[PDB]
Design a protein around this motif. Structure first.
Motif, mmCIF file in Angstrom:
data_model
loop_
_atom_site.group_PDB
_atom_site.id
_atom_site.type_symbol
_atom_site.label_atom_id
_atom_site.label_comp_id
_atom_site.label_asym_id
_atom_site.label_seq_id
_atom_site.Cartn_x
_atom_site.Cartn_y
_atom_site.Cartn_z
ATOM 1 N N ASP A 221 0.986 -1.020 0.095
ATOM 2 C CA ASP A 221 -0.014 -0.039 0.062
ATOM 3 C C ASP A 221 1.018 1.259 -0.038
ATOM 4 O OD1 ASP A 221 -2.160 1.840 0.225
ATOM 5 O OD2 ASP A 221 -2.376 1.273 2.314
ATOM 6 N N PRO A 222 1.757 1.555 -1.274
ATOM 7 C CA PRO A 222 2.835 2.302 -0.979
ATOM 8 C C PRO A 222 2.196 3.708 -0.869
ATOM 9 C CG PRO A 222 2.699 1.676 -3.127
ATOM 10 C CD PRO A 222 1.663 0.629 -2.354
ATOM 11 N N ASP A 223 1.145 4.446 -1.487
ATOM 12 C CA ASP A 223 0.357 5.648 -1.261
ATOM 13 C C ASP A 223 0.399 5.891 0.003
ATOM 14 O OD1 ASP A 223 0.419 6.023 -3.876
ATOM 15 O OD2 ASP A 223 -1.653 5.880 -4.249
ATOM 16 N N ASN A 224 0.208 4.932 1.214
ATOM 17 C CA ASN A 224 -0.040 4.906 2.494
ATOM 18 C C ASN A 224 0.979 4.631 3.463
ATOM 19 O OD1 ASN A 224 -2.816 5.145 1.407
ATOM 20 N ND2 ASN A 224 -3.720 4.535 3.286
ATOM 21 N N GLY A 225 2.318 4.717 2.982
ATOM 22 C CA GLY A 225 3.611 4.369 3.429
ATOM 23 C C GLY A 225 3.816 2.598 3.445
ATOM 24 N N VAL A 226 3.336 1.921 3.135
ATOM 25 C CA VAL A 226 3.360 0.454 3.343
ATOM 26 C C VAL A 226 4.070 0.107 2.025
ATOM 27 C CG1 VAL A 226 2.475 -1.794 3.756
ATOM 28 C CG2 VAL A 226 1.457 0.254 4.734
ATOM 29 N N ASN A 227 5.414 -0.073 2.037
ATOM 30 C CA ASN A 227 6.381 -0.727 0.950
ATOM 31 C C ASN A 227 5.901 -1.960 0.437
ATOM 32 O OD1 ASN A 227 8.106 1.885 1.707
ATOM 33 N ND2 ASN A 227 9.758 0.544 0.866
ATOM 34 N N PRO A 228 5.953 -2.054 -0.945
ATOM 35 C CA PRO A 228 5.772 -3.590 -1.320
ATOM 36 C C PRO A 228 6.675 -4.745 -0.655
ATOM 37 C CG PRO A 228 5.997 -2.014 -3.246
ATOM 38 C CD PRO A 228 6.333 -1.477 -2.096
#
Ligand SMILES: Cc1nnc(C(C)C)n1[C@@H]1C[C@H]2CC[C@@H](C1)N2CC[C@H](NC(=O)C1CCCC1)c1cccs1
Ligand SMILES: [Zn+2]
Length: 339
Positions: A221-228
């Protein structure tokens, strides 16, 4: 010593006959399904066939142990060394193929991209022949001491160690069976299923029960800081669903989609069932030979433990007819095939 031979002559022959029939039919069906229906297209399929053979070699010895319990050793010296040989080969190769199935799954699941290059029919075939050679050479010292002999009026089939080295041989042959048959598969189980479970979890998809959103670790969830490449379990609890904005509490685990991940259930069931049938003998064998110094030598505890060895090894011999049942229930392909 207490004579249980009069009792064993009545009990063992019908027991060994059922196990032979059920086990021969069961393992034969597995073999015809793998060669004819499945046609041996994977590395897994090669090891399953070889495991099914190890159970058969071991099974052929069972009608001979039955007759020997009933009457006496009427098959002679070569037969005594052959059947003792096939029993040990069938035992060692059996657990070696359970270990090879575990390693195969550890490669497919943990090192997935490499596995595409490494897991071939021919590499599975090459490793099987090596396994058989190792098993024959692991059984060879045991075949050496085994012989047929007339003790007074009756013929026996047993292994006899030189009197001046008897304690050494019992000690050594116990540690070969315990290291190879209990310790070695256990380290293979702990090391491999540690990696398998860690890969399975870090790759688990989770769906929001409110909006239906699917979190995929691969995407993140990269838009929310959660890296792939983030396990959903490692995401901080201040994170909310990108769609409906609800917390992690509302998220449910998605059932396995990957077939290679699904196949883990079968191979782990095979290994756990092996330990239910064979860890009892392994512990009693270790308790008998060694633990007399570290436990009890009483005419009671010596007779109790020797009877316990007779029971725990009969239980293990039973394991040769168990894998077909596992494939019939747990095995997904085998389930749909029969359906
Ligand atoms: C005889 C006879 N009747 N029934 C059996 C079993 C099937 C229950 N047996 C034999 C089969 C083989 C040949 C002797 C023994 C009992 N069995 C081998 C047992 C052997 N264990 C050991 O040799 C120990 C004894 C103490 C030091 C080693 C095993 C080889 C592979 C698994 S167990
Ligand atoms: Zn949502």
């Amino acid at each position: 010593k207490i004579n249980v031979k009069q009792i064993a002559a009545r009990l063992l022959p019908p027991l060994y006959s059922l196990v032979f029939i059920f086990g021969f039919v069961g393992n034969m069906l597995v073999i015809l399904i793998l060669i004819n229906y499945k046609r041996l297209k994977s590395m897994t399929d090669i090891y399953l066939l070889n495991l099914a053979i190890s159970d058969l070699f071991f099974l052929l010895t069972v009608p001979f142990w039955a007759h020997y319990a009933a009457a006496q050793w009427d098959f002679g010296n070569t037969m005594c060394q052959l059947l003792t040989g096939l029993y040990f080969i069938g035992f060692f190769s059996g657990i070696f193929f359970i270990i090879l199935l575990t390693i195969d799954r550890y490669l497919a699941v943990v090192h997935a991209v490499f596995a595409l290059k490494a897991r071939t029919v021919t590499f599975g075939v090459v490793t099987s022949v090596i396994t058989w050679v190792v098993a024959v050479f692991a059984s060879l010292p045991n075949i050496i001491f085994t012989r047929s002999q007339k003790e007074g009026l009756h013929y026996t089939c047993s292994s006899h160690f030189p009197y001046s080295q008897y304690q050494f041989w019992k000690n050594f042959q116990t540690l070969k069976i315990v290291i190879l048959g209990l310790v070695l598969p256990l380290l293979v189980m702990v090391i491999c299923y540690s990696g398998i479970l860690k890969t399975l979890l870090r790759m688990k998809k989770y769906t929001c029960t409110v909006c239906g959103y699917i979190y995929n670790p691969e995407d993140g969830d990269p838009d929310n800081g959660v890296n792939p490449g983030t396990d959903f379990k490692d995401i901080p609890d201040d994170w909310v669903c990108p769609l409906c904005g609800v917390g992690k509490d509302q998220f449910e685990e998605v059932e396995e989609e990957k077939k290679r991940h699904r196949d883990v259930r079968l191979i782990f069931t095979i290994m756990i069932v092996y330990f239910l049938f064979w860890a009892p003998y392994n512990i009693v064998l270790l308790l008998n030979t060694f633990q007399e110094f570290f436990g009890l030598n009483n005419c009671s505890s010596s007779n109790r433990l020797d009877q316990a060895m007779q029971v725990t090894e009969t239980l293990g011999m039973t394991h040769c007819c168990i894998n077909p049942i596992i494939y019939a229930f747990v095995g997904e392909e085998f389930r749909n095939y029969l359906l």
